[PDB]
Design a protein around this ligand. Structure first.
Ligand SMILES: Nc1nc2c(ncn2[C@@H]2O[C@H](COP(=O)(O)OP(=O)(O)O)[C@@H](O)[C@H]2O)c(=O)[nH]1
Ligand SMILES: Nc1ncnc2c1ncn2[C@@H]1O[C@H](COP(=O)(O)OP(=O)(O)O)[C@@H](O)[C@H]1O
Lengths: 176, 369
């Protein structure tokens, strides 16, 4: 093969899933959390394990990135700790929530190319990828995760933003 | 080992209550005396958490505080009333002593200026009767005031095993100089910082100074010269903190020479350059020492409370402390010629004269004998 492996990173409100394109399942899954003392930054399971001595942050609590400084740390963690690869050496496919603000899409792009120096990247809507996985390009996806749920109508591969609905009721609420 | 604290009079209760607030916040202890989630050895001053305090109107304002879940004016009048309740208050101490694992000492916080001062002098003698093997350190505070001040001095010179002086005239000048207050609750902020900093090496264990006698055995050369003074600079390299402590503007005291010095650096300073600074401070000769016996300067590090930057405290034994007794002494004589035996005042006046006579002779090349 001439091409290096491409990375697939699913940014979840509660859990991030990361791995290599072509594989049947993610190689790693970890909590979307970053913690600092009440090693300076803790990310993923370690932040959770040592939460007793840390102040936890959830940078993508409801599917949308709210703190880019900590989101950058989650991505750093994803590449160097979880996947053990150098991002500048692999194309990266990232996922985003439905109705993600345009400015956020540009921010993610700028960070990948300027901060991580990715050779290539792409961003796809989560619901659309799930529909693809089912072997379809048209249909409506009910995506219910940890911090948010969405109903996303998709036609011919394109999500229909005007018909997308967000429900602030998901796994977290059910646990409580 | 544990250390039981006592709080006498209006001053002792206030500076002790502020000492415990600062010591609770320094640790992870909620005002409800319950440990919050959020290494620091806290068994010495807290009991499994309960403070080992013995408080003695002001108590009500303490009980109306958010910290309720944490537990005349003559010297003769203050001495007699302690005799009539002799058995009463000791039952509180006797149960706390035997309930303690291995007692070490008795911290006393009181002002010698008057029911509390009189009660203190009484209790200081009885502790010598019952417990012979327990240190008694007193965080006395200086101001008919001349009378009461010298009487308690007669007991503090032969009963109390150590003593740390804190005079209001030096603290009040600081509040107007670097704090610009123009109150009691304001200057006590500084007293609490010195008290909390004094026992820092006891709560955060290190290679040395893991017991109260470890700090005292170096400074006090003979049982007579048991008076100390303090210095607190930040109101950063270690050489900066040492040079700022040896300036007269910072000491809490209104020829002469030093007997022993102890420095407490509480910051995150680099612990490799600490031995360097003691090499250079010796060269400039910033302090003059005793000629008879050998003396040196001591620096000890610690760690600040993370739940709450470099600070510093200096415990010294300077023979210039003799001047403070002189003021009380001279003030007494002027009142003695102006107005059942009045013989106790005579003995107290005499014994403090020997203490002053020790200091002025402690600075000579022949203090031996
Ligand atoms: N350093 C200091 N001294 C105090 C404080 N409050 C009172 N004093 C001293 O206590 C003396 C008054 O004693 P007082 O409370 O009348 O005695 P009591 O009436 O027998 O309790 C004064 O001379 C003050 O110097 C304080 O907050 N700090
Ligand atoms: N078998 C299950 N039954 C019910 N809830 C589940 C199950 N497995 C996982 N969950 C819940 O699903 C949520 C995580 O799903 P996920 O789609 O990964 O969310 P996100 O992408 O937002 O982090 C959590 O609330 C978790 O408790």
């Amino acid at each position: 093969d001439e091409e290096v492996a491409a990375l697939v990173v699913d940014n979840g409100s509660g859990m991030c899933k990361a791995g290599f394109a072509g594989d049947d399942a993610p190689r790693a899954v970890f909590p979307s959390i970053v913690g600092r003392p009440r090693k300076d930054s803790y990310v993923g399971d370690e932040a959770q394990s040592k939460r007793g001595i840390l102040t936890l942050k959830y940078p993508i609590e409801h599917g949308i990135v709210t703190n880019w400084d900590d989101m950058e740390k989650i991505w750093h963690h994803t590449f160097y700790n979880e996947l053990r690869v150098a991002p500048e050496e692999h194309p990266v496919l990232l996922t985003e929530a439905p109705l993600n603000p345009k400015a956020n899409r540009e921010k993610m792009t700028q960070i990948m190319f300027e901060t991580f120096n990715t050779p290539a990247m792409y961003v796809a809507i989560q619901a659309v990828l799930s529909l693809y996985a089912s072997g379809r390009t048209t249909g409506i996806v009910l995506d219910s995760g940890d911090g948010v749920s969405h109903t996303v109508p998709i036609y011919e591969g394109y999500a229909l933003p005007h018909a997308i609905l967000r429900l602030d009721l998901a796994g977290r609420d059910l646990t409580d | 080992r544990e250390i039981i604290t006592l709080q006498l009079g209006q001053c002792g209760n206030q500076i002790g209550f502020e000492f415990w607030k600062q010591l609770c916040a320094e640790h992870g202890i909620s005002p409800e005396g319950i440990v919050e989630e959020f290494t620091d050895r806290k068994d010495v001053f807290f009991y499994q958490y309960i403070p080992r305090a013995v408080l003695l109107r002001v108590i009500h304002s303490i009980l109306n505080s958010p910290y309720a879940k944490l537990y005349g004016n003559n010297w003769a009048s203050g001495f007699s009333q302690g005799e009539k309740i002799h058995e009463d208050i000791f039952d509180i101490i006797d149960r706390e002593a035997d309930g303690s694992d291995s007692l070490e000492g008795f911290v006393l916080c009181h002002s010698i200026a008057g029911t509390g001062s009189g009660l203190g002098s009484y209790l200081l003698e009885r502790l010598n009767d019952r417990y012979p093997k327990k240190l008694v350190q007193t965080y006395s505070v200086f101001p008919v005031q001349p009378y009461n001040s010298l009487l308690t001095l007669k007991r503090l010179t032969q009963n109390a095993d150590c003593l740390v002086v804190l005079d209001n005239t030096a603290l009040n000048r600081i509040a107007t100089d670097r704090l610009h207050i123009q109150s009691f609750s304001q200057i006590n902020q500084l007293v609490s910082t010195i008290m909390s900093a004094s026992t820092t090496t006891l709560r955060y264990p290190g290679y040395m100074n893991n017991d109260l006698i470890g700090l005292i055995a170096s400074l006090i050369p003979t049982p007579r010269l048991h008076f100390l003074m303090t210095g607190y600079t930040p109101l950063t390299t270690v050489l900066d903190v040492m040079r700022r402590l040896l300036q007269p503007k910072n000491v809490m005291v209104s020829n002469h020479c030093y007997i022993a010095i102890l420095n407490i650096i509480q910051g995150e300073v680099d612990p490799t350059q600490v031995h360097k600074s003691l090499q250079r401070i010796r060269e400039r000769k910033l302090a003059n020492f005793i000629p008879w016996g050998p003396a040196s300067i001591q620096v000890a590090l610690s760690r600040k409370s993370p739940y709450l930057r470099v600070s510093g405290l200096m415990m010294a034994n300077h023979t210039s402390i003799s001047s403070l007794f002189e003021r009380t002494c001279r003030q007494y004589d002027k009142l003695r010629k102006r107005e059942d035996n009045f013989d106790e005042m005579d003995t107290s006046r005499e014994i403090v004269q020997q203490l002053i006579d020790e200091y002025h002779a402690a600075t000579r090349p022949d203090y031996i004998s």
